[PDB]
Structures are given as C-alpha cells and as structure tokens.
C-alpha cells in the first residue's frame, strides 16, 4: 500500500511483467516434451506438467501484479472447465497477440487487428474436420489429449465406437483395484431429484426404484403462494381420473420450497389406501434454460405446464401414465427401461434439436447457445456408463481419474464441433491462408492490402502463427537443419511436424496428432480478447473501499 | 499523522496533485475508444470502462489526499445517481475550470468567471432540443448512452414509443434466460408500505390484494403520544359511519412507531365481526416533500388530514370508500384497477402540477424543486413494466442490468428536460455564442469587453470548451490533417466530429450522436462549483477530535 | 516471500544446491564405516548412522529449498517402508543420474539415457539370485542388513530355516529382560477385527476366543442403506437353517457404519435363547484390493457374496459352519486350530496365487501388483511368532527393535524377489554388461553405437556405476595401491571388495556381503525417475492460494 492508483507507463510495465512471467512458466510445460513445475501446498509437493494446474496456482506477491494475473489466468482456466485440454495454447496467443497490439498503436490499427484475427478464426471454424465415432482419428485425438496413453485412448474411443448410434454419458469413481473396471447400463442420466428426503422409500433420501409412474412437468418455482392450487390439482387427479393412472405421481418442477413440501407430505397421508409397502404415491422433484424441462417432459410422456392451476384442467388426452422403469435419487434420477414406442417419441424430438443446429451459422455453431442444445441431445440420446478407475497407489488412482476426464471432455467436443491437425500447424495454415484469400481476391485486394499488408500487420501476424510450432520443435531434430525453418509453399501443402513420443517426422495427419476444434478456436478467440484488454488498459486501482 | 493542519502552498499543491491524478484516470475512460481500468476488490478483478465505477472506486493513501478526492468524486458520482450517463464530463470541467480560476487570481476576477460561465449555462439551457417519445432521436440518445447497444437502445425507445401518452415506470430483475423478457402491467407504483408485518393476509408481511378499501391520509408521525386519538377516531368511524364504508380502512401516514402499531392490533381484535378471511380491516401504512402524501390522497380519493384528532369530525362528504383494486406490499403498494371516474380526478391533479412547470423560470426548470415535481407526475400518470434482463453468464446479466439502468435514466431525463448535439460540440457553440452575444450587443459591449475580453478570460474559456472535442478526437483521422484543428466560423455553423464506433466523419446531428441536456448542463454547473471550491481552499484539517 | 515464481537458471541452481547438500549428508552414513549425523528433537539428541533416519529428518530454511528436498527425500523414505535397508543407495544414484542428464542435454539424449538405464535395470532383474530358506546366504544378507549383528542375524535366519515350509509372520514387542525371548504359535494373523466393542465377550472390546463358528464374507460397505436386508438375511438364517449351524455367526465385511452396528445389536437381543454365557451370537467384522476378503473367505470356508440381499437365497451347499478355533480381537483376529481337511483347501488356493506369479513378466515380478499378491500368500500360509526384544536400557531395547524390523523386512524381500552380490559390484557388472551386450550383438551394433557409445553416454554411465564402490572403499586398503582402481576384465570375472567389519579382501560372494535384489533394483528405478524429475524441472511455485 505505497500507491493505490497506478496510471500509464507504470501500469503497462506491470502488465507486461506479469504476462511475460506467466508466459515463461506455463508454456514450458507444453507438449509431451514440456518441462516440469513444482508447486507448494502446505507440507507436500504437487510436481506437474499439466498447464491448467500451473496456470491456476501461480500467485504473485504484489496486489497490483496479482490483479493482472487474474485477468490472464481466469480465461485459460475457463477453457478447460468447458472444453478439455487447451489452456496453455490460450495463454501463448494472449502473449503473442498482446505483443502485436503494442507493435501497432493508434486505435484504427487496433480495430484492423481485431478484424483480421476474427477472419482467421472463421478459417479455423471452416477447417474443422467433422468426424464420426467409427473413425480411427478419435483414438488419435484421445492419444494426443492423454499425453500418449496407449491404454486409455484405446478404451474411450473403443467405448464410443462400440456404441455406434447413441452418445455415451461417462462418469468416474475412485477404484479399489490395479485394473480398471466398467459398468455399462442402458440408462439415461436425467437432471431431476428429490425435493425433500421424506419422499424416498424408507423416508430418508434413499434410491427409490419404480416400475410405473405418471409424470407432470411444471415450469414455475413453488413456494408459500402455490399451496392452495396443489391441493386443488392433486385431489382432482386422484378423485376424477383414477382409472387411467399408474402410481406414483411425479411432480417435476424448477424448485420446491419448504412450505410446499410440507403440504405435499400431508396429501400422501390423506389417501393411505394407495400407499403400497411404505412408498409415498406423490413426489415433488427439483432441477437447478427452460428447455431442459421440456426434454424431461418428452422423456416421460408428461405434459408441459406453465401454471400450477393447470393441473385441474386435464383429461385422458393429456394424462398418460407410463409403465416403464425409473430410479429416483438424491443427486439425480435415472431412466432405464424405455419401450420402443417411447424411444420413437424421443428420437423425433432429438432430430428437431439437430435440425436447429444444421441451419445455424458457422460462428454460431461454436457459441454457448449451440453447445447448450448439444447438451440436451446427449441427455436424451445417451447411455450411462460408470468406470471405476484403478492404479497402484491412491494418488495414481486420483491422478488417472483426471486424465480420464480430460479425454472424455475432448472426444465429446471433438465429434461435436470438429478436429484439426495438431502441432501448431492448423494455426499457420489458417493465418497464411486468410492473408492469401483477400489478397488474391481482386474485388477487395485494393483495401485489404491498404489495412493489413501495406501497414505490415499481415506479416507480423504470420510470424506469430509460427510461435506454437517453434515452441514445440525448436531444439529438436526438425529444426537442426537449415538454421531456423523455411515456411514456404512446399510446407503449406504437406506440413511436416515431429511426433515427440516416437521421434519420427511427417505430417500431423500421418503421425496421428490432432487437436480438438473447440480448443484451438476458443484459445484464439479468448487469446484476442485478453490480449486486447491487457494492451488497452492504462490504469490499476488497488483500493478496497 | 506528521502534520494535521495544512495551509497555503502545501494545501493547493495537494489539491492540484489529487485533481490532476483523478482527471487522468477517469478521462482515459471517455467515449467508446476510451482505455480501461482494472479494479481490485479482495480476490477478484472488475475491469471496466464506466467512468462512474472508476470515479467511485479511486482511493488515496494519504488522508489529506483522500480528503480532496472525496470533494472531487462525490459531485460526479452524484450526477449519475439522479441523471444517468454524465459523470466523466463533470470531472473534466472540474479540472478545466480549476485551471481557469488559478490562471486568473484576485476575487474580482473570480466573481467575473462565475458570471460568464453562468451565462454559458443559460446558453446551454436554451439550446435544449425538446423531444417527443415519437422522435427517432430518442434511439440516438439511448444508442449513445449505451456505448452502441443495437439491441438495447432499440428496445427501450420502442417501449417508450409504444406507450405514447403515459410515461413508463421501469424496474429491473436478474433474469434466468439468454433472452430478455418483458412484463407489462397497467399499474402505478405507490410509495406506501406496511408499518408492521402483522397487518398483511396470513399475519406475516405478505402481499395483500384487495378489491375495495377506504383510505385516510395523515400528515404527522405517529408514536406513543397519539394512542388516545386513534381509539377516538377508529371507534367513531365504525360505530357512526359504517353504512358508507368498504373494508379495509387504510391509515396512511409518515411514520408508525412500535407503540401505535400495538394499539391498532388490539382495535382489529376489538371488532371480530368485520374480519373477512383473516385480512385485518385496519392497516397503518408508512412512507420514507409532504406533497407525495397529497398524491397518495388524490389517487385513493382520501381526504388530506393534518392532525390525528380530525378523524372524529368527518361526514359522508369527506369520507369516500373506493371499490377499485389495490395490492399492499412490504417494499411498496401498487394500484391496478382504476375506474374512469378516478382517472378524471388524477389527470386533473397531474395537469395542475404541469401548470407550475410551464411557468417556471429557465434556470428553475433544471433545479431539484423541478425534478421532484416531475417525479410526482410519473408516480401519478405512469404504467409499470418489469424487465428481467438476461445474458450468457451471471456477471453479464448484472453488467447488462446496469447498462439498462443507465439508458433508462438517460431517456427519461432526455425527453424530460432536453437533448443536445454531442461529441463535445454543444459546449464550444455555447461559449463561442455567449462571447459573441455580449460582444455584438451594442448596449453592454462597453463593459462586457472590460470584464471578459479585455482581461483575457473569454479567450481562456474559448480554449477550454475545446477540451472534450480534443480528448475524444485527438490521435484520430479528424485531427491528423492540418496540425491541430481550426475552430472557425465554417466549423461553428456545421460542426464536424467522428463517430468512434463506425469511423466516418460528419455532424453530431447527421451521425446521430446526442448527449442528454440535463447531463451536460449539470456537468458544467457541478464543474464550476467544485472548481471554485478547490481553487478557493487554503486550509486542510485532518484531526479526528 | 521476496519472489514466489522462480524460473530457469534460478530454479535449476536451487535443485542442484539441495541435491548436493542432501547427497553429502546421507551418503556419509553409508556402510559400517559411515560417519555420524546428530539430529535435534526439542530437548534431546538422537545421534545416528541409519540413512533413512538422516534423510527423513533433513530440513531446509527457505520454502523453495524444502520444496525440492521433499522431492529428493520422499522416494528413498518410501523404499524402506516397503523394502527394508535401501535408502542411501536411492539418493546416491538420484545424484549420479541427475549429473548424467545435465552432461547430455537436448531431449533426444534424455530419451536415450532412459532407455539405456532401463536395459541396465533388466540385467539386474535377471541377475537376481533366487534363494530357499535352507540357504546359508540368508544369514549373509541379514548380517549385511544389520551392520554386522552376529546375535540377531543368526536368530532370524534360524527362525526362517527351522520353519522350512511355512513362511513365518513376525511381530515385535519391547521386552523386559537383557536376553531375547520368542513365542511360537501355530496361528495365522487375519485382517478382520471388531466393528463395535459391544460384540466381544464382556461387551467392551475384549479378546473373544471361540471353538466353533459360521462365517459369511460380504463385499459392500454397510451403512444406513442396508438395515432392511440384514434383518431379512439374519432371521432367514436362524429360522430356516438352524440345524446345520455352529454359533457364533460372523458377518465379515468391508465396513460397518454406526447405523448398521446398532441394528445387529438388536438382532442378538431378538433371539436370547442362543446367548451362551453372555457371548453375542452375531458379530460384524471390518477390514481397512478386494482379493484379501477372498482369502478370509477361503480360510474360514465362508461363501463370497457381492450384495447384502444374497444372504436370503442360501443353502447347505453354500453354508458350512466350521468347528475349528478362532480368536476375535480389536486390532486383528487370529486362527489357530485348522483341520488337515481345511489346510488342503488353503494350500490349493495358495498354489493358485503362486501359479499367477510363475507366469508374470520379469519386470512385473518386481511390481506392487506382484508384492501385494505375495502379501496374500504369507497371510494364508504363515505361522505367527512374537519376539520380545531386550537390551541394557529402554533406549537400546527400542533401538534394537528397529534393527530387528529392518532384518525381517530384508529377509522377507530377499527370498521373495532375489539376492545380488553387494559392495557396489552388481551395479558395475550390470552396466558394463549391458554396454557389451548390445555392442557385441551384430544385429543392432550399428545404432547402439550411434546412440550411446559414440555420443559418450556409455562411458559416463559406466563411470557412474563405480560411485558406490568408490564411496565404500576409496580411502581404504583396496584403493591405496595403483593410484585409483582398474576395473578391467580380470576384475569383472572375480570382483574384489573389502569387508569393512573385518578388514580382509575378497569377493562379495566369498566374504558374504549380499544386498537384497528388491533394494538395489528399486534404488536404481527410483534414482532414474527422481533424477529425470529434478533435471527436467524449470519452474518453482511457492504460492499458498
Ligand atoms: N506427440 C506430439 N507431437 C507433437 N505435438 C504434440 C504431441 N502431442 C501434443 N502435441 C501438441 O501440443 C499442444 C498441446 O499441448 P498441451 O496439451 O501440453 O497443452 P494444452 O492442450 O494447450 O492445455 P492443457 O494443459 O489443458 O492440456 C497441441 O498444439 C498439440 O498439437
Ligand atoms: N459514437 C460516438 N462518437 C463520438 N462521441 C461519442 C460517441 N459515443 C459517446 N460519445 C461522447 O462521449 C461522451 C460521453 O462519455 P461517457 O459516456 O464515456 O462518460 P459520461 O457520460 O461523462 O459518464 P458515464 O461514465 O456515467 O457514462 C459524450 O461527450 C459523447 O458525445
Ligand atoms: N561388511 C561390508 N563390507 C562392504 N560393504 C558392505 C558391508 N556391509 C554393507 N556393505 C555395503 O554397504 C551398502 C549399504 O549401505 P547402507 O545400509 O548404509 O545403505 P542403505 O541400505 O541404502 O541405507 P539404509 O540401510 O538406511 O536403508 C551396500 O552396498 C552394501 O554392499
Ligand atoms: Mg492435459
Ligand atoms: Mg454509462
Ligand atoms: Mg539398516
């Protein structure tokens, strides 16, 4: 607390200090050849090469430095929390693009750097190699994202390929044995669960399996206001429409407050003739994006309802009690048995969501909105699998669980969005291409030249695409010959890289080195934003009021 | 705590230091091109360009320095809290005018600077372009005050323009979805609320809806002194005048203390024949400027009463029980159903307040006295709308709620008081107008020249009106040609600026760049005083006694 | 707390600093000639030469230095916890191999050094001399591991050799006398113990001896979820199948939570007719690697059961109550009386585990997978013995107990995995052999030369195998002649060392100086990993988040 207000040269000096320091730490771990980072936590030592673990746990002494560090880190951290294996690439570009912005000052040049890089992103978005579960490149992506795990990459891509038709939902648990072990189900993970522990079998939050139910989906949150309409709706359903009904009745909703749960507890005891072996016949279920409830409505053949008063106005046309098989739970509910008739309804709805995605724009296909609709698809069409991951020690078990989870994340987002050739090649093909497109285009060559090429940003941006390919293979066999390396036309057609596991040289395509499309795009997208913010900030305020 | 008394050279040296530091930090965030500010708060980083959020959160290490900072910050902070988008302009002029005051010392010159700038405020006040909700310039103000929000400016201007007759009262909630959602009501927000939670339906502070009531507005604050007269008045109303009475009875007042609420609770229990389904038939209501209660009286057809003893001396002439529809609440009460007979009374009372604003002086029209009276008009004639603002994250939703809030505040005060051409032009036109008006006027040129032109103040002030235009457009396409820029007669007739979003050059009128009149006027008003205060201070005291 | 982020030159310097200080301290204790280390602990002084004790309790002032010290110390400490006598070796090589990694930089050389040393490991693994309990080398191993204890080594070797057939399980107690005293039993230590103290005789955790029982092994952890099925299973067993039953019933499992134990307390009280002299007839037993319960199932003739619901569906074909003799206990249970009919079942299961080890790989034979399976064999076939260790003080008794425990750990892992000739010789033979093997082989001598010999790695790695032999005998009778020492053919065929206890010179085989194979292997394996880690670290982080 010497100076709480830092403006101008000093500010940009500290920004540049923190960036370059964070850059040298995190990039050192990149690739399988990356060098290590030892981290302190109290009385132990987590020694690692995982870039996400380095990025997250770097800390600074000065509040002003740490203020900048959080701006560089929380974008890269946030990539893996949604993607899987692509954090270090984000920080690299943040550094490279920041260095660019400062090379070309004046806030027309800045707007030209934004526009050019956004057009490079579009080339990557179009480059996306779409892939099916049959494909052996899935193994290659998983082999890439696992730091060469012969055993692991083989399991997951087999597990996806062996379910050629339905997209698997995988969960992980700490295993007891040395060997791993799999637990396949024909079950669908559903996002609903108990409102109160009383509504389970045994009356204490147990896992209630059922062989028949009659579901209803409400949109509104239920609190002290709704207590009248529940008694109206429930006694209407059991008194009038008891003929076409399979117990128990599920009331699926957004939220159930403690006032509403106590009322529905009394409604179960009101009709004790329907209580078979202790099981309550009425269960309220909660879910923590209103379309995720429409899925739940569609899965269980339940009607969609907007108000709690709508339960009175119902008929056999809208009420349909399923004779399937459900497992209600405290964390989540699981549907197992689905008749061919019910799966027919769910696939037709699943095509409808895929038909919205088919016609989305190119950049819209990599949006949050798009990834949220693909989440809904996996909920509907997707079997449940539970892998108990093993190892020699407990610490290898827990370490291996993380490397399983990174792979699962990558394979899913690979076939979802796309795949690209790795080794920092796809980035170089993209930049060098986007320059050649607008320049070769005689229509806009006039102005395209005057902004980018004429100014010299094009050639700067071309040198920066190299960074990754330099970081990986500078000081290896590939770079020993011919001083540095000639990025000529002959390379651009058939791009040579080195596999750092085996040692051999060839194309990324031939050697089997692939990145996920969503990573290297979202790295660049976030890399630009965070490079801009750093480059365009001129003031730091340390005063907690 | 070295020195607790600072006089003279040392005192002004700190003021100049603090004013220059706060200037550089805040004015860097001006315009859409504006550079950013990172702010610490514990373990997070709010990075922003909003000059308010910067201004408010600047802190200084030395107590002496922070003493002066509070004086420079609180006026600019206090502009947004009543206007919406007009804070950075305040600090700019506070700097600019401080420099003017010190350039011309001696307390005859000081008096002259005030008078000249005060006449410049009048020329701004007369430049105010009055605008209807119909007008497409409302979009242009909203667009400007939103930093180019195509979606937001369109929505709020559509919402005002679709209600061409009744001025909307908007509120904002944290929305769940990606999309926004709109909740239009035919309701008027009223400032009364429950004294005690016992008086609602269910006896715990709930939202009691009613379809009939008989209100009585009291002026005085109620405490232990008034417990006798309530029992006199209440039993007089129920025993004698029960025939012309619709329950419940509303006792609206300034403040109900805990002694009086315990008495009225017993008065409800005293007559249990009138308690219809729990609802207490007597409710005391509180409000946190006595004419706001006169509005509440006119809305509910209740008689205005000075003393609590007046409740006995009443008749069927003074008492009038409404059969409308009211919703009593803990934060505020709302009236929805109003019979065309009632809105005939309310509109006539609304015109009567507009009668006072028509004939007010020009400088009186921008006062607090004026704006408070306009607050009354919106309480009387105004529908209620509640927008649940959405987005991708929680932080974007809360970020976007403020940008909604700032646009609403602007649009309201735009049509309320006026609209001016932005881009720091209007200020130049104002100063170059005021100097020429007094100079060209044959009657007062003899003395006008001797004060302002001969002493050199006019030329100083002419240069300072440029400050805003220079900060925005220096280092751009507009200032590149011909060194600096020529503010000649050719410019004053048709003033050129640069739209910083698009990059094209033109008039503020032609490009659609508009500041609110109340902002740029209250920026100057506040600029002068605060500049005066800083320039006319020669002693700082730090001692907590 | 000056800097929390150490990168590059600074990082490697501290690693080298710490390694070379930890090397100097621990290696000085090596062999019987080793020099001493005094260690503080509050208000006393443990003065020692046992390398494990040195390494573990070395600390550093700077957090950065202690960060690295944990990485050097935790591997060698973790050798003796499983192996017995082999920590200083591990550190010695960690130093040596680190040195090598730095001499040959560039990460193709790093992969070469690994592959070469990995083949040196294989040659040691093949050099492993397998040994029977009858053999007099077991004494020679013990003699080495005890720093020459004539009285101790003789006992433990005599103890294993007198039980020529069954592998003795040894435990230790602090004795009262000067002399040692032994307590032989025909008892088998079993890993089950009381869930709750209520289930023992006297109802407070006592040692309940039984002469008849009927055991049942459950796989799952038992908590509040399983309380229904236990009452279903227990009353099914006692009501239906009471004829073929010997009390008490033992419910062996993974874990019994306090909800399940309170249920079984009521089930004993439910049938008081079967309570003979206080003893509860139903005991739940817990165990803190799923195949160890299959051993417990086989030892007691109990059926293996996955679910708790399986107890209902049972028959005389699956149920068999033993009429042996068991001793239940708080820490562990003990089986004494086993009929020849039972031991036939247990020996056949033991051979079945051994037939898995017959068919393992050479490198897999030294795995934790292998060592866990061999732990199962000793539990099955293995008589119990308890030695109360004596001495002249309390401190010598406790000192001597550790040296017993090292010899037991060594002798067990010697005959388990193998024996090698000590005096640092087998390391020199292995390295000098592995070089000559690949070189001599005309098939691969083309490339083997190009990688290892031509580069100079071979000659460096050969020099480093000397390290151990140099540190023992440099500055002795063996090294005084001929300046340094010639490691020619003549030596390799008959490798001369010195017995530092006597003084005389001869072969390690002849003098009787033998290392445990598992030690000098797992030292090298660990030395390579930890050298690599140290040599490939270029970032230290001290930030406590
Ligand atoms: N065998 C290989 N040969 C060459 N390059 C490889 C190989 N495996 C991975 N890469 C490259 O290394 C880069 C990925 O590095 P790495 O996985 O260490 O960091 P990241 O994916 O950016 O972030 P994270 O720490 O989340 O994994 C990719 O550009 C990829 O092409
Ligand atoms: N597209 C544009 N082109 C040119 N000038 C613009 C544009 N948009 C806004 N401005 C100018 O920016 C100034 C307003 O600055 P800004 O909105 O950053 O701060 P403020 O309104 O003083 O306070 P606050 O921080 O509360 O918004 C006005 O003078 C206006 O003319
Ligand atoms: N009488 C002896 N003559 C020659 N060498 C010996 C003799 N006794 C032991 N050694 C050698 O000394 C080495 C063992 O030393 P030491 O027991 O101090 O190391 P360590 O086993 O790694 O440490 P710790 O026993 O604390 O785990 C072996 O190489 C062994 O061959
Ligand atoms: Mg990874
Ligand atoms: Mg604003
Ligand atoms: Mg020892």
Numbering used by the authors:
A (entry chain C), B (entry chain D), C (entry chain B): 2 to 289, 295 to 551
What wording appears in the published article?
Our structural and functional analysis of the chaperonin ɸEL from the bacteriophage EL of P. aeruginosa revealed that the protein is ATPase active and functions in aggregation prevention of denatured proteins. ɸEL forms tetradecameric double ring complexes, which dissociate into a population of single rings in the presence of ATP and at physiological salt concentration. Our functional data rather suggests that the chaperone mechanism of ɸEL is encapsulation independent, and represents an evolutionary precursor of the more complex encapsulation mechanisms used by the group I and II chaperonins.
The ɸEL heptamer in crystal form I (4.03 Å resolution) consisted of subunits in closely similar conformations (conformation I, r.m.s.d. range for Cα positions 0.28–1.36 Å). The αK-αL helical hairpin makes additional contacts to the intermediate domain. These contacts appear to stabilize the orientation of the apical domain. All subunits as judged from the electron density had either ATP or ADP•BeFX bound in the equatorial domain. ATP was cradled by the αA-β2 loop (residues 30–33), the N-terminal ends of helix αD (residues 86–90) and helix αN1 (residues 428–430), helix αO (residues 474 and 478) and residues 504–506 and 519–521. Intermediate domain helix αM with the catalytic residue Asp412 (equivalent to Asp398 in E. coli GroEL) was at ~6.5 Å distance to the γ-phosphate of ATP, consistent with a conformation poised for ATP hydrolysis. In crystal form I, the putative SP binding site is solvent exposed, consistent with the ability of ɸEL to bind SP in the presence of ATP. The other crystal form was solved by molecular replacement using this model.
